[PDB]
Amino acid sequence: NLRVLLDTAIPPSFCDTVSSVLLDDFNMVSLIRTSPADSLATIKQDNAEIDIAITIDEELKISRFNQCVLGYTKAFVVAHPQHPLCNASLHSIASLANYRQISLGSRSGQHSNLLRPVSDKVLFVENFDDMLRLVEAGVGWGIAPHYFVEERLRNGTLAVLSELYEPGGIDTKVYCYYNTALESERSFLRFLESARQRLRELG
Amino acid sequence: NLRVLLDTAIPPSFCDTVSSVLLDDFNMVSLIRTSPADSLATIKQDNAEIDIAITIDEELKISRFNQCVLGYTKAFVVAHPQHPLCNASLHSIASLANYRQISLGSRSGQHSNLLRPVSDKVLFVENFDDMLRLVEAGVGWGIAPHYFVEERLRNGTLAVLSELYEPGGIDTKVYCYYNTALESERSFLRFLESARQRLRELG
């Protein structure tokens, strides 16, 4: 049984690219969703017996776990279109520290450099749905995956703030953390090259 | 006088893209090179009176300074081709912690998460030339900009270790740190859009 972790920031397209390739080499494959804020925390528990984690979160070295880059994905800073910072100019790019942020909470209470909130007005939530609910209600701003806000943006329910900070959205590495055992096994190298190559060939 | 900092990790192509655009709006423009390890340390001294810094290094918020992304650039982990880890397989991807790394030193003695060395066998140097000199002599491995190793790689003097960790080289954001004053001034927005757009249109 190969236990596999995908954080909720991972696009579900990318989730099918992984779930597919693994079944080629593997008989039993358990798939687990987690907050990006809970991914690395989870795999560090020996109980969880996680073998592969696919997360946007970064940590320099982990016990018993190697890192590598599967690919890249986009994130946007979003707010209610009527939200004060709608003009999205460079004064708003610094004003975020002053306005309320809807940030992902972590069970572990702690946050990485990456997922730590930027403002002092912070309101924690377990997932991106709770986040964008509160953001649709002008309660604050937040950083969510592209696939979570693709719909609402065209439907005018949400606006972007990030385009001056980083045009085209915020490029974000998807890391593959894998148990050191797998580093030898060909079936794992298969998964890497396949998954990787299948996201190059899927924009 | 507009004081502008570019770390040595910034490609010199990208350096001409900046040096060009600024002269359109600005009369006096001082250009300063620095170790990526010394960039953010430098701009935090009030004496330095730096207005714009272009560096790969990251820090969440700085006093009096806003962040944004000008673009992306590539880095490789390189070694002498005869270096033990030449086979570049996934056991070598974890063995780096055991082999000697030629890491950039910082005057400030401190390092960011990004530029902190990975191994315990570390030998510090001031610049990428000292690094790749020692690396050509099989003394250890190091992470250098693409433009620093483009030559030596084709000329077989150096080999890559990174391609399993991150095929195509290690994607690296180039940040623009700018004094909060500039956030309003149109001439600065000019520089952003121009510099940015000129690196989209220069691969």
Ligand SMILES: CCCCCCc1nc(Cn2cnc3ccc(Cl)cc3c2=O)cs1
């Ligand atoms: C005008 C300032 C805008 C920059 C906001 C500060 C940033 N934060 C980050 C880390 N970060 C966080 N939350 C995510 C959620 C989802 C996804 Cl897909 C990515 C990410 C992410 O990269 C980068 S950029």
Ligand SMILES: CCCCCCc1nc(Cn2cnc3ccc(Cl)cc3c2=O)cs1
């Ligand atoms: C098999 C493990 C290989 C990963 C090595 C660990 C990394 N380190 C980093 C940060 N880092 C550092 N030094 C640079 C120098 C020059 C340039 Cl252009 C970039 C960078 C850089 O990103 C990322 S990846």
